[PDB]
């Protein structure tokens, strides 16, 4: 399960890495604001402090959202159940 | 399962196609910005770079969201489990 | 199951009705913009064309979101599986 | 199950408490607007009436979202099924 977590963890990193590269290049964001925007996008928070202004950016966001949501929320799912929960359970039993 | 994917795939396309037509016509968006807005709406990202200004638009968005979310997120679910996951698994075994 | 759908359907209506009343009264929205804002809130779309400006409004939105999301998304779930899906299946068999 | 509810209830409170403290301190929000922003963030509503302007804030929001969503939506899940639903069922049987 650490290896089930690891695979999704890597895949999410590669997914955010890619959004960072596209949005910094085509939409002109700083690398930090691209990563931020990528995370705010794929988690469906969506503040809209940053949004794509080019048509190439709008098109890529359509595909990025559809490809990216399933992954991101699977990692989060993994993270909650296989990492956060046991840690919580361990804090209720002094060793 | 390719046919379970195909049905939802088509249904999502028809759903976005329809939002594109309504928002381009009634709210005055370019066809590209209507599709974009439709996708950002039904995935619950919701940047708000575009939002409906007419009452007819606000009313349609209420119904579009309620009818559209279940579909869109079922496709995404299908896509992650029946397309992305196996592809991932295949990349871990050289042929 | 029509009665399982009916209960949630009513409960969602009562939930939106209430947001409409609070936001029209305390935040000063038109009744149509209050309902719209209520729907955009509880589905987690969240355009932000409208947002609460008073502290009483911000506090109520915290509680409304927490109480309202579970309901709204249960109705949508019901709607997709018990209404949309069978209708789809029926359209693939001429009578 | 009251104790399953209680644990998540506490954990959500501690999670919002922490966002309130970070956003009030680093981003300069009033304590009420920090809590509000924290709730609007972790539920993925995301109006964007408030968004982080510092790089330290953007970085923390990335981690807060990933750590916080699984918890918040588990509480909501608990709340809907173990509190709201039975209460609803009880209202359909006069004592
Ligand atoms: K979900
Ligand atoms: K959302
Ligand atoms: K959102
Ligand atoms: K949003
Ligand atoms: K927004
Ligand atoms: K805005």
Look up residue D39 and give its two tokens. Answer: 């709730």
* Closest approach of A55 to chain D, Cα-based (Å): 23
| Contact assignment for C46 to D49 by CB distance below 8 Å | no
D72 touches A46 (CB < 8 A): no
CA-based nearest residue to A35, from A16, A52, A10: A16
Asked if C41 contacts C20 with a C-beta cutoff of 8 angstroms, the reply is no
Q: How far is CA A34 from its chain centroid?
A: 12
Report how far apart the first and last C-alpha atoms of chain C are (Å, whole number).
24
d(CA C31, CA C37): 10
Alpha helices in chain B (DSSP H): 2-26, 31-42, 55-79, 85-90
C-alpha distances out from residue A11 to A74, B19, B39, D34, D71, Å? 10, 32, 23, 32, 22
| D45 to C47: CB separation less than 8 angstroms, yes or no | no
Contact B66 C76 (CB under 8 A): yes
How many residue contacts between A and B have a Cβ separation below 8 Å?
Answer: 54
What whole-number distance in Å separates Cα of residue D54 and Cα of residue D74? Answer: 30
Asked if residues C69 and C5 have their Cβ atoms less than 8 Å apart, the reply is no
Pair of tokens at residue C26: 């305390």
Burial class (CB in 10 A: 0-12, 13-18, 19+), C54: exposed
Helix (H, G, I), strand (E, B) or coil at D80: helix
CA distance B35 to C32: 25
Q: Does B88 touch chain A (CB under 8 A)?
A: yes
Phi, psi (5° rounding) for residue B29? -80, 150
Q: Does B49 touch chain D (CB under 8 A)?
A: no
The token duo for A72 is: 């991101």
The pair of structure tokens assigned to B43 is: 């995935």
Rounded Cα distance, C41 and C64, in Å: 9
The full 3-state SS of A30-93, as one line of letters, equals CHHHHHHHHHHHHCCCCCCCCCCCCHHHHHHHHHHHHHHHHHHHHHHHHHHHHHHHHHHHHCCC
- Helix pair C31-42, C2-26: axis angle to 10 deg: 120
Q: Are C18 and C12 in contact (CB under 8 A)?
A: no
**C-alpha C59 to ligand 2 mean position (Å):** 20
**Cβ-based neighbours of D51, under 8 Å, separated by 6 or more:** A47, A49
| Experiment type | X-ray
Residues A54/A69, Cβ–Cβ less than 8 Å: no
Q: Which residue has the tokens 């029209």?
A: C24
Helix axes A55-79, D55-79, angle to 10 degrees: 60
CA of A40 vs chain B CAs: smallest distance (Å) = 8
Closest approach of A77 to chain D, Cα-based (Å): 7
Distance CA C23, CA C34 (A): 5
Residue ranges of domains in chain D, CATH in brackets: 2-89 (1.10.287.70)
Longest dimension (CA), chain C: 58
**DSSP single-letter state for residue A93:** S
Q: How far is CA D75 from the centre of its chain?
A: 9
Residue C3 burial by CB count (10 A; 0-12/13-18/19+): exposed, middle or buried?
exposed
Place of tokens 């916080």: D68
Secondary structure (3-state) at B49: coil
- Please indicate if any CB of chain A lies within 8 Å of the CB of B83: no
8 Å CB contact between B70 and C77: yes
User: Taken in order C61, C66, C69, C72, is the CA torsion positive or negative?
Assistant: negative
Nearest residue in C to B56, CA atom: C32
User: Could you tell me which of A3, A30, B31, B50 has the C-alpha nearest to residue D59?
Assistant: A30
Are A46 and B32 an interchain contact pair (Cβ–Cβ within 8 Å)? no
For D57-89, give one letter per residue: b (16+ CB within 10 A) or e.
Answer: bbebbbebbbbbbbbbbbbbebbbeebbeeeee
**Which of these, D42, B66, D84, lies nearest to C39 by C-alpha position?**
B66
Taking only Cα atoms into account, the Rg of chain B, rounded to an integer number of angstroms, comes to 16
Given a contact cutoff of 8 angstroms between Cβ atoms, the answer to whether A69 and A42 are in contact is yes
| Nearest CA-CA partner of C38 in C13, C74, C59 | C13
Tokens standing for C32? Answer: 């149509």
Closest C-alpha among C14, C12, C21, C20 to residue C71 = C12
Task: Sort out which chain B residues have CB atoms less than 8 A from C40's CB and list them.
Answer: 46, 61, 65
CA dist D52 and D39 (Å) reads 14
A44 contacts B44? CB cut-off 8 A: yes
Cα gap D75→D69, rounded to integer Å:
10
The C-alpha atoms of residue C32 and residue C69 are separated, in whole angstroms, by: 20
| Beta carbons of B81 and A69 less than 8 angstroms apart | no
- DSSP character for D78? H
**How many contacts, defined by CB atoms under 8 Å, are there between B and D?**
5
Using the beta-carbon criterion (under 8 Å), do C84 and B70 form an inter-chain contact? yes
Short-list C22, A86, C16, A29, CA closest to B63 = C16
Window 17-36 of C, Cβ < 8 Å to D = none
Tell me how far the alpha carbon of residue C8 is from its chain's centroid.
11
The CA D73 to ligand 1 mean position distance, Å, reads 9
Of the candidates C66, A71, C84, the residue with the CA atom closest to the CA atom of residue B68: C84
**Spatial distance between the Cα atoms of A28 and A25, rounded to a whole number of angstroms:** 6
Taking the centre of ligand 6 as the mean of its atom positions, its distance from the CA of residue C67, in whole angstroms, is 25
| Resolution for this experimental structure (Å) | 2.0
The answer to whether B76 contacts chain C (CB < 8 Å) is: no
């Amino acid at each position: 399960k650490d290896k089930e977590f690891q695979v999704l963890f890597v895949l999410t990193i590669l997914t955010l890495i890619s959004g960072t590269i596209f949005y910094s290049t085509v939409e002109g964001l700083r690398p930090i604001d691209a990563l931020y925007f990528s995370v705010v996008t794929l988690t469906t928070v969506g503040y809209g402090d940053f949004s794509p202004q080019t048509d190439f950016g709008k098109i890529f966001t359509i595909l990025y959202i559809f490809i990216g949501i399933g992954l991101v929320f699977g990692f989060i799912h993994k993270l909650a159940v296989n990492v956060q929960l046991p840690s919580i359970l361990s804090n209720l039993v002094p060793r």
